[PDB]
Amino acid sequence: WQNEVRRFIPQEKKLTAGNPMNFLGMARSINPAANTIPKVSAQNINIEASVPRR
Amino acid sequence: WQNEVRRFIPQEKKLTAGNPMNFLGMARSINPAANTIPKVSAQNINIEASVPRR
Amino acid sequence: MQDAITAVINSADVQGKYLDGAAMDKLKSYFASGELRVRAASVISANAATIVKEAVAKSLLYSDVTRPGGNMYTTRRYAACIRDLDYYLRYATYAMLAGDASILDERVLNGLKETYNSLGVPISSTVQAIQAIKEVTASLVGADAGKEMGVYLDYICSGLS
Amino acid sequence: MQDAITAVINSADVQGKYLDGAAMDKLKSYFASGELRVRAASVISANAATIVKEAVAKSLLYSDVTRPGGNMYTTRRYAACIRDLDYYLRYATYAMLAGDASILDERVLNGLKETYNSLGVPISSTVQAIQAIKEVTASLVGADAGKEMGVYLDYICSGLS
Amino acid sequence: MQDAITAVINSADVQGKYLDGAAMDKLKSYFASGELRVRAASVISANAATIVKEAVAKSLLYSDVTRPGGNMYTTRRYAACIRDLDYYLRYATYAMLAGDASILDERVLNGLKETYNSLGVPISSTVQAIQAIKEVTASLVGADAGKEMGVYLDYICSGLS
Amino acid sequence: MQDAITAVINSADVQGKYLDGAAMDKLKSYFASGELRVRAASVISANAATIVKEAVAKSLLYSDVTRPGGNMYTTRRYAACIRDLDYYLRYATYAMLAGDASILDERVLNGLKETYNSLGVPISSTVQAIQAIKEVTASLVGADAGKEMGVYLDYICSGLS
Amino acid sequence: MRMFRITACVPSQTRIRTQRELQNTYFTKLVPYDNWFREQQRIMKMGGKIVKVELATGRPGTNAGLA
Amino acid sequence: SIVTKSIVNADAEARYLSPGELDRIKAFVTGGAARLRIAETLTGSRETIVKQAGDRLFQKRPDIVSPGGNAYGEEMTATCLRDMDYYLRLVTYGVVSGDVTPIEEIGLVGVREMYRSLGTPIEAVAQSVREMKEVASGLMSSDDAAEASAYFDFVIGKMS
Amino acid sequence: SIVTKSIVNADAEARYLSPGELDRIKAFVTGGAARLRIAETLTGSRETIVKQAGDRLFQKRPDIVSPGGNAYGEEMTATCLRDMDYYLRLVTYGVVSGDVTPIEEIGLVGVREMYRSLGTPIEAVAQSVREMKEVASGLMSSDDAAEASAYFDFVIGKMS
Amino acid sequence: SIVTKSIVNADAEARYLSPGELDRIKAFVTGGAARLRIAETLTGSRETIVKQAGDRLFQKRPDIVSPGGNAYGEEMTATCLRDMDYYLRLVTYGVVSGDVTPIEEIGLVGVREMYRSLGTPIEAVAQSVREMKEVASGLMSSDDAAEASAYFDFVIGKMS
Amino acid sequence: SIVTKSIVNADAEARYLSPGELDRIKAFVTGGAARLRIAETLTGSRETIVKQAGDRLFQKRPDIVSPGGNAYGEEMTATCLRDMDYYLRLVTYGVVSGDVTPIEEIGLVGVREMYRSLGTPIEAVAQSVREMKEVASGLMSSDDAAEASAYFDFVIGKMS
Amino acid sequence: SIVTKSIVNADAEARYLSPGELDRIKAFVTGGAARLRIAETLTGSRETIVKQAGDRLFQKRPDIVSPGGNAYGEEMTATCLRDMDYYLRLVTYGVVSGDVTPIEEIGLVGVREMYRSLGTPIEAVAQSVREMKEVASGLMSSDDAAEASAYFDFVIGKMS
């Protein structure tokens, strides 16, 4: 006793080939170690010997 | 140091006139009165006079 | 036109010979197909409108194709494409029960690409229309019968595409 | 191909008439718009490489088009798509400098529609991509210059439509 | 066919929107032009035979076509040209009253080129007769009605050319 | 171009005779070397950009060669130097696999000394860069492979010098 | 691939050109062996004179090992 | 439109437009201001006109939304509102054009095939357009009500 | 009857019946016992199968008997029961004929116009005849299931 | 496919297949069993191979996921791993074909345009496919690892 | 120099530098005082402009200075400051010369091959040059800033 | 040699050899022992293979040694046998080299023009080299026969 409510929004779409969905969770398994925020002044670098003279 | 973490999903395509999505909330605005489940079994109806005869 | 049985007949007759062993075995193969093809034809004829209905509902329906600007717009072109899908389904059934695609390219492919280009019909959109028709038929005819439905409808698409 | 000035000159030459009041008023309108067009050209050539990036990112990324089976998968297809967007941006900037749609008729839209059809590339998705680059260019070039860019981009879409 | 009133309707409906201010203004402009359109159509209908007579007199008569062997020879053929010029004038009047030159390429220009090619009709001679009709009608209906009639007749000629 | 095989073939054919004992022995020697030849070729192809990168980094970068005044200053000249080093490495690999430097002076040594002298390229810096390629390749491939690449690089430096 | 290098001075004998033409009047170019005969014949036909030529690439008299 | 209808009728007989056709077009173009204003009025109340039109329709024929009906949930009721706005736009097109043929060109040719391939009861669609006509005439002048009711009535007739 | 169809085709071709037609009527006449058995079984168990299929149609499409549907009111559901009886009797007639001519010309040709005049949802009748198909298959033998289902499929497809 | 550019090279010269190209096809067809085995071993071990390759890529060069990087987003890491999967499939296709036709003709031509549009460094993905080669040689037989590493060297060098 | 560009363009058609160009060289030589003044303005404050240009670039893209990035070590960031100083000097050369030909001849031809052999994310270079442009605009007196914006923006366009 | 063709094809793309070419070089260097054995076998008995092939051609084409023939006469027969020996030596050169490049470069380029200058029926020469192939296959191992006959047959086809 019901009617399958006719869906025009394509809801419940399986993750097909091409979707990075299938890697998101495994990326969660990977959990990449994002590097810390660098603290570089970029204001006191005396650029006369910090540049290599090879 | 704000960063824009762009998500998986494609940018949602702008709603158009033809799509009934713009009417969807209107439907919830309507909230049309549904109908109860008719409780008739048709077994106790006998087809000799229950059918109209005029 | 011609089907597999007529194919063996005229293949033998062009050389003016009787039924050799090769014709004998391909007739055996077609007869072995037999009841499967006719049962698939009957099941297709049963819910004949249903295949086209859910094929439209899956791919074409509720999209820019059926929206303003798309070739599906207005009731006239909607009914026209429904009639086109009915032609495609009936002729696919005929080719299946015959087992040959001569009916398709003698009754469909001749000028259909150019006749759609004259009307500017989307060839690709029709392509996935027959595509959706493929699985809508396969969900009611089985796997092998559905497989041959897919083969013939793919031939129809390739002729159209 | 002719700009607004050369278009006016050719129109006057067609009737064998001198530049009447309409000729000078149109010429002065183009001369007034020249400042805006030149500055918008500088701004758009500024970010022609980067602008198409977010133009396609919000239009044709992580969608059915980019995935395998889609007509934008494979490095050739994505590269040709970004190159087509670059071509559209460059030629629409050319038209904005010239202030006329004549260049697009023969150098862009001429043969493009059936070229895409034979290629099988999705024309509708190209239309939405050109719309997206329309807003992206309007964001950087301003409102009035944005409107001038958008009219040419919509002309490209209509020709491809 | 399409007219100035339904042209706006189709233009608004291709994107599916309603009638906005621009469409309203276009409809009011057509309704303003309707006075001159109706007057010109009535005057042209009253004097169609004389107009075609005068156009034939100053563009075709006493020339190589009318001489023996020419395409105007064989009086059935002369009546055929009289009928063709009457058709051109009447359909030009239809287009002028409608406000859009869609009936011209749908009921006049459709197939005319290969028609005249197969019949060996002088295309440039017919074009010259059409400009003669345009000049005759413009000198009888006024400046603006003659303007519109010349516009639609020149569209017919360009289709011929 | 003469390799270890075609050189022997030509030396035999100029005298118009078949393969004698000395040709047998030298072809056997090349056949024995072929395994290491292929292995070293794969090793070089794996890191083809790498050897030039660290060679330029260790022998060219951060010196008067690349400083203002050096011939490797400016992006165009820097890219030309990098392209030249890549050409030299690829042709050294080719001569390695062929077993002879005939291609080496047939394709990359054709007037290169005159070209560099006319362009003012420093021959000493070029030889230093070639050597820097030499030890990088020797480290990446091995001892004997490094020596057999170094012989071809010495051919390059002698031709340039 | 056994290429020739040729220096030659081919003049213009039919038209007076108003743009610079030293590049295509007196030039030294590298011509492939298989194309050298055709190039020499064409340059001869246009009145050009082959000032000088030598086998820049390859070794003369090689029976095999030409490609 | 009416001009297109007159042109087609004249073309059928291969003649110029008769004085009756000409002065009919005359009256139509002269009075087009009222027609355009009525089209504007119908366009303005579009959201509300669709709103109470659908409300009255569902209260009159709940089966189309009831269990077993074509439009059960808010999704298919939204699709009904979409088609409802379609035919409101069609009636506006007819009012501005002045003749029913564009409606035939848009939403009346092969409509039975449409609503048989979809299972939609076309009688319910006719009732919805009738609710169009009733509420729209409620929210406009009586003479303008009749002017719009001509096209609403024609759409209703093509429904049934 | 297939005999009438074969005679009609032969008369159209102005030729005596071909060997295919002769074999067709031969197989029909030799197998008439099974068709008569199917007809007798359907006639005997008609009252239960029609009621069960109507109940299943109600279970699929309750709106047809909801307050405002065509079947609502015990008169208007007894009329559905009578219509299902009529279609079952038509199928029984066709089973003993070998072709679908009586089905076509008694209840199929012009059925859409009748159900449009009465307002009946013809797709609901298609579901009802489908349910008749499952009920008949359940009550009837496996091998005869193909024969009965062929006619039910034909009626569903034509009347869908 | 070795045969595809063998035939293309032959057609470009307007000649039949040379003995050397024929013999190369001979050896390819005779040794295709190992290529198919490598195809199966790469298809089966996809998850672990991509996981370890991506982890070692991240640990060598954290800048891809460092702040402001193109892969800082958690979704960006999964997109990068999707790229890893794509290139692994390309390598499998190439080893299957015995030739580097499908690698270049699916994921190599114009990849630099790919990465300039998306901003991904080319050297980073080159190092990633190098890690793929390393882990694959770790999981693969030595003789088979020779050819697998050869094709990985091809892809890394050409794409470098 | 604008003079050199005009000479080359005229030589392309073998013309005599038509007055439509001669007036431009005349205006350039007349107004060269302002361009020279912009030259001293950028030369004197080159240190600060490059310094907070690198500050802004690192704030928006800390990958390069990060340990995984190309600029890590406080010597490679020194190299980025050095390269930004070089491109600032190139922009000064362009503004004094009058056109962009010195910029192409010095630091734009083959720049992609330059920064691909170094692993530099050239997009980051374009961002840094853009921030240099913004800092110059802040330091430059409006219209002078707009004038130098042509050269800075041309460097931006050719760098990406 | 096959390696020379490998570097030629690679330099045509300005890139290192693909895995296919390196595989070709590896297989060739491995099988060089067998190839050199085949070459030595052909060289040792060469005066017998050429001899028997010339005799067999004489039976198949008596016109060649018939009066008025190109090879008619003891000296002309000797010259033809010298040609046969030359082409056998070229086939040995091709066998040792691994490809057919030396064959074309020595005895197949412009051979038609040469024999037209000599007026020779080159088809008979192709028949002669076919006889040489058969004689060589008779006295040589079955497995080696394929490799030798491939080059003999390329010579035949190019000269046919």
Ligand SMILES: *[C@@H](C)[C@H]1/C(=C/c2[nH]c(/C=C3N=C(/C=C4\NC(=O)C(CC)=C4C)C(C)=C\3CCC(=O)O)c(CCC(=O)O)c2C)NC(=O)[C@@H]1C
């Ligand atoms: C005086 C006796 C009568 C008269 C004659 C008249 N005719 C014209 C002009 C034309 N007559 C023709 C006729 C024909 N063309 C054909 O091809 C055929 C035979 C197949 C015929 C009968 C044509 C075509 C013309 C016009 C074109 C041309 O002349 O080349 C005129 C002059 C009309 C004018 O205005 O120039 C006259 C006077 N008219 C009468 O009233 C008498 C009954």
Ligand SMILES: *[C@@H](C)[C@H]1/C(=C/c2[nH]c(/C=C3N=C(/C=C4\NC(=O)C(CC)=C4C)C(C)=C\3CCC(=O)O)c(CCC(=O)O)c2C)NC(=O)[C@@H]1C
């Ligand atoms: C991670 C260390 C590496 C990296 C990955 C990365 N990729 C994307 C986005 C895309 N990559 C592709 C790739 C392909 N398309 C193809 O057709 C082929 C095979 C034929 C490939 C390899 C595509 C299409 C996209 C866009 C859509 C998608 O993700 O699938 C990103 C996102 C970058 C951005 O700004 O969008 C990233 C981070 N990036 C690196 O720097 C590493 C080398």
Ligand SMILES: *[C@H](C)[C@H]1/C(=C/c2[nH]c(/C=C3N=C(/C=C4\NC(=O)C(CC)=C4C)C(C)=C\3CCC(=O)O)c(CCC(=O)O)c2C)NC(=O)[C@@H]1C
């Ligand atoms: C609502 C009260 C009634 C009803 C309507 C209904 N319609 C649909 C679906 C569609 N309706 C159309 C119609 C048109 N499209 C056009 O372009 C034109 C002319 C402008 C018309 C007339 C179409 C094309 C669809 C398909 C979906 C789409 O629009 O893309 C539904 C939903 C059907 C489904 O199962 O999704 C409904 C409910 N049905 C009733 O029972 C009511 C009486």
Ligand SMILES: *[C@H](C)[C@H]1/C(=C/c2[nH]c(/C=C3N=C(/C=C4\NC(=O)C(CC)=C4C)C(C)=C\3CCC(=O)O)c(CCC(=O)O)c2C)NC(=O)[C@@H]1C
């Ligand atoms: C439907 C799958 C797609 C579609 C198509 C579409 N078709 C038409 C119009 C016609 N299509 C046909 C079909 C055929 N002619 C043949 O000879 C054959 C073989 C029997 C076929 C299948 C015909 C005859 C017409 C014109 C006649 C008519 O209308 O009956 C249209 C309308 C074109 C128009 O308005 O001019 C359309 C839209 N549209 C889609 O969206 C589908 C992907």
Ligand SMILES: *[C@H](C)[C@H]1/C(=C/c2[nH]c(/C=C3N=C(/C=C4\NC(=O)C(CC)=C4C)C(C)=C\3CCC(=O)O)c(CCC(=O)O)c2C)NC(=O)[C@@H]1C
């Ligand atoms: C990107 C928005 C869409 C897309 C692009 C795409 N295009 C092609 C191929 C071609 N594109 C063109 C177009 C032009 N070339 C020109 O010179 C100009 C003149 C202004 C234009 C407009 C052409 C000619 C081609 C064919 C040749 C080519 O390979 O470039 C492709 C690849 C097609 C193929 O089969 O490889 C693609 C993918 N694809 C989409 O899905 C986007 C919507």
Ligand SMILES: *[C@H](C)[C@H]1/C(=C/c2[nH]c(/C=C3N=C(/C=C4\NC(=O)C(CC)=C4C)C(C)=C\3CCC(=O)O)c(CCC(=O)O)c2C)NC(=O)[C@@H]1C
């Ligand atoms: C900095 C924000 C970005 C970056 C740059 C970077 N460059 C180098 C090293 C060199 N660059 C050059 C060449 C030029 N720089 C210029 O400004 C111009 C003027 C036309 C040229 C030609 C040179 C010569 C070097 C040094 C090598 C040599 O001495 O020849 C580095 C350091 C490279 C190294 O290995 O030390 C860096 C970091 N890299 C990034 O990641 C930033 C986006």
Ligand SMILES: *[C@H](C)[C@H]1/C(=C/c2[nH]c(/C=C3N=C(/C=C4\NC(=O)C(CC)=C4C)C(C)=C\3CCC(=O)O)c(CCC(=O)O)c2C)NC(=O)[C@@H]1C
């Ligand atoms: C880099 C290691 C050294 C260096 C290089 C350098 N070379 C040039 C210019 C040219 N180099 C060549 C050489 C070749 N071209 C080829 O195609 C091949 C064979 C395949 C070779 C070996 C040529 C022909 C030129 C001139 C033409 C051109 O631009 O390609 C330059 C530029 C000189 C100039 O004035 O522009 C430079 C800098 N310079 C050094 O200092 C390094 C030791």
Ligand SMILES: *[C@H](C)[C@H]1/C(=C/c2[nH]c(/C=C3N=C(/C=C4\NC(=O)C(CC)=C4C)C(C)=C\3CCC(=O)O)c(CCC(=O)O)c2C)NC(=O)[C@@H]1C
């Ligand atoms: C004239 C007073 C003297 C003279 C001239 C003369 N020149 C030629 C032919 C050529 N002259 C040039 C020179 C140039 N071409 C260029 O583009 C430029 C650089 C901008 C120069 C300097 C060339 C290239 C040619 C040959 C090609 C050509 O003419 O197109 C001739 C004709 C020689 C002939 O017989 O063809 C003559 C007569 N001769 C005198 O006696 C005067 C002293």
Ligand SMILES: CC1=C(/C=C/C(C)=C/C=C/C(C)=C/C=C/C=C(C)/C=C/C=C(C)/C=C/C2=C(C)C(=O)CCC2(C)C)C(C)(C)CCC1=O
């Ligand atoms: C659902 C459904 C439907 C059916 C709908 C249905 C069920 C419709 C039926 C609705 C009903 C039952 C309406 C009742 C109306 C009674 C009135 C107006 C009597 C008033 C009496 C008065 C004022 C008398 C007062 C009095 C006076 C003055 C006196 O003098 C003194 C006393 C007295 C009390 C007599 C449809 C048919 C529409 C469609 C199909 C469908 O399924």
Ligand SMILES: CC1=C(/C=C/C(C)=C/C=C/C(C)=C/C=C/C=C(C)/C=C/C=C(C)/C=C/C2=C(C)C(=O)CCC2(C)C)C(C)(C)CCC1=O
């Ligand atoms: C088949 C074939 C051919 C070959 C064909 C051949 C074999 C051709 C050869 C033909 C021959 C053998 C010709 C010889 C003729 C001798 C003459 C005319 C001498 C006369 C002497 C005189 C008059 C002297 C008389 C005298 C004088 C006067 C004195 O003083 C006194 C005495 C004396 C007797 C000496 C070709 C080459 C064509 C083609 C190839 C090919 O296969």
